[model samples]
Target chain A: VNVQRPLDALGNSLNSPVIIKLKGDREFRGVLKSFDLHMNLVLNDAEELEDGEVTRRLGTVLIRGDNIVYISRGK
Target chain B: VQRPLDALGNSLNSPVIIKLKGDREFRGVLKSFDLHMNLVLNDAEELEDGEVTRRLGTVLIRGDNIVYISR
Candidate 1:
């Protein structure tokens, strides 16, 4: 009784933690927070910025997961 | 729907979300992307869990690390 929703599709129980990289430079690590009907996400704290120019910038960020490559468990 | 400039001063709009190892995540809208593929993001929201935190929020993911994207 497990079902997965495609892009533009919305549902619940999205327990998929994916890796989000910024142009292959910066990267964040966290689980799939929330998603809109547009395939956008309200992700949690994935990781620190690749550049340490600032302090903590963690919270809900509206991101389009479609731009991601792969979610690695670091294994 | 790409913007010429982010809230900062970058000229690339590739907003994305990044998920790292150990359930640590970061999400934000992209500010800029360079020829080297380097990114400058904006409107980023970081999570601070004082206890056993749950990950849930909107983020901006990058081009890489991106497993899937749909609209």
Candidate 2:
């Protein structure tokens, strides 16, 4: 069974690639580094996406939880 | 300055803007909320770039789909 609190799914996702969608149309793809209870995400080798295309390279970053919409496993 | 949930507590009974995924936004008077941050709102209305496009009356928003909330 795959029932658990949301972040539990994310815990095992660490060190893997992830796609994070935020407020507005902003999206980011990167390696999941670490996270906490409120969902602050530490991403490495992060890159910005616009309309599904890479627009900019954002090194390591901590994406604030308040701005996050969803997290997805990356391709 | 306000804490996370405290911010919502402070905004209770007041009009606030909830920014969600897909560029969707809703403006409403906050009525209640849960520890998960899911909330109920009164006089809810959807907004498009600051313009009200529709009325939702009373509505409940799931916390996981929420991006941000503010007055």
Candidate 3:
């Protein structure tokens, strides 16, 4: 995939709820706040989902891009 | 000369083993990174004493904490 595709996808996803799947079965649900060329993501109103449940409430967080498998728009 | 960073760049989307400053280790797929060597790993997990402790999923590890990486 062209690197631009993901960047465009993320650009269009700003301020929207998105699901991010990370490398280790870690999942995050949050509104996309910002992103950089490197794919570093800033999320607001974030929640950490573990075992299909909300384990922690992360108000805002920065997710390093390397660990991301994919980002999905909210259902 | 092809430096370590160049080698790592060539390894994009490949599986890698990262050993941190501490005894902790992480195994995952290299997705994206920067000059700082800060890395983002997909499908990652943590190992301690050679035993799997937890699934890290997608994680960003600080480059400063990295000791070495094996592709």
Candidate 4:
């Protein structure tokens, strides 16, 4: 058995919808694909969310790791 | 070198999009940045709701206000 870090918690979320919060207030929602040690992420069916509204439909996105503030499982 | 910093370094002198804490976004050529994430940009434009609202020339952004960086 191994104790996992917060990022490792993400492994269980693969292929599931997740919400990623970046620095500032920008957020993204999409199906989780993969991530690296730097936190760089690949997402499918991604969309930018602003004020709780979908503002942009981003089909697939590769997010820069430094910009990430938080991430969590979602619908 | 750290990949994230390496990634950002690769973006230098290139067009980059920055999202700020107040929902304001800026697109500009990356001029410089420090470990603290403070940034300098040239030919910058302020975006509101994804639309260009103002043009800013040679701007300095405090690292604390930065939310994200996109290429």
Candidate 5:
């Protein structure tokens, strides 16, 4: 039998949205799709829209994974 | 039309996400970039509880204080 704690659940729980938020104008949002051997991410729905724009266009964007500051999800 | 805005050695027209290191976490729009690569951010909001929020006052932030800039 396996006992899981709330903190432990974080691992198996639904992955939150992680974005490679560009300097000031754009952010790429989606569940992390994949990463290159160099640690770059291939994100789904990666539309390079204006920052703070709610309208989403579906696609993929490649970004240096290390540039990612924080990953967030709907609360 | 495209304008030849100087980067001040700073590039402003490019998309970026700047991380400001301090007690307060913030995010905003890069309205203008100057010859020194100085950044002028507009329509900014702060990150509260993992969300962006409107600023109270004196929203202008110096580019030097910025920890990192990404596009």
Candidate 6:
């Protein structure tokens, strides 16, 4: 991999659990779809997180790219 | 812009439903969008609780706030 950009790396995270921090202090983890240059996302089977606690189950959500604060590696 | 540009081309000028972060949805004729996903919509109406509320006519929608674009 030339590693010039990160989409491929992000794609590698697909089908796995990944951590996503969004705007409004909301956080989540779910089976990932991948990344767009616009940074928009589709999370498969999302679980809402609060202070490390899994608080809510959101079936699937499309995360607006601008709402994302971070994406952390997970199982 | 390079990612998934193929998908939205099918939606250009077509009716669409866009959900944003503020718990609002806009149904409109998609006019155009930019690299940043700022969308220009025509004949737009805002929806709340799945009920039509505001008639914005034509407006600019922030891509950053968009939760999803549904057609």
Top-scoring candidate (lDDT) = 4
Q: Interface RMSD for candidate number 5?
A: 11.4
Clashes of 4: 2
Judge candidate 5 at residue B5 and give its lDDT: 28
lDDT of 6: 0.74
Model 2's chain A TM-score stands at 0.89
Tens-place lDDT digits, model 6, residues A1-75: 346976565677777888888777678788776567666766668877767798867655556676778887754
Could you report the Cα RMSD, in angstroms, for every candidate shown?
A: 13.1, 8.6, 11.8, 4.4, 13.0, 4.6
iRMSD of all candidate structures: 9.0, 8.9, 12.8, 5.6, 11.4, 4.9
**TM-score per model (chain B):** 0.36, 0.88, 0.93, 0.91, 0.51, 0.89
**Residues forming the 10-long window of minimal summed lDDT in candidate 5 chain B:** B1-10
- Kindly report the fnat of each predicted structure, to 2 decimals: 0.03, 0.03, 0.00, 0.03, 0.00, 0.24
- Measured against the true structure, the TM-scores of the candidates, in listed sequence, are 0.33, 0.52, 0.52, 0.65, 0.33, 0.60
Best by DockQ: 6
Which segments of candidate 4 are over 4 A away from where they belong? A10-18, A21-26, A30-46, A51-53, A57-70, A73-75
- Residue B42, candidate 3: alpha-carbon lDDT: 99
Question: In terms of docking quality, how is candidate 3 classified?
Answer: incorrect
List lDDT for all candidates, in order: 0.44, 0.77, 0.75, 0.77, 0.46, 0.74
Instruction: Give the residue spans of candidate 2 off by over 4 A.
Output: A1-36, A40-75
Q: Write the per-residue lDDT of candidate 2 for residues B11-38, one digit (tens) a residue.
A: 6898877767666888899999886679
Top candidate by TM-score: 4
User: What lDDT tens digits, residue by residue, belong to model 1 across residues B1-71?
Assistant: 22111211222355454444333444466555542224544665554343324333433343444332211
Question: In terms of TM-score, which candidate is stronger, 1 or 3?
Answer: 3
What TM-score does candidate 1 get on C-alpha atoms?
0.33
For model 3, what is the error of residue B53's alpha carbon versus the real structure, in angstroms, after optimal superposition? 16
Clashing pairs in 4: A23-B67, A24-B67
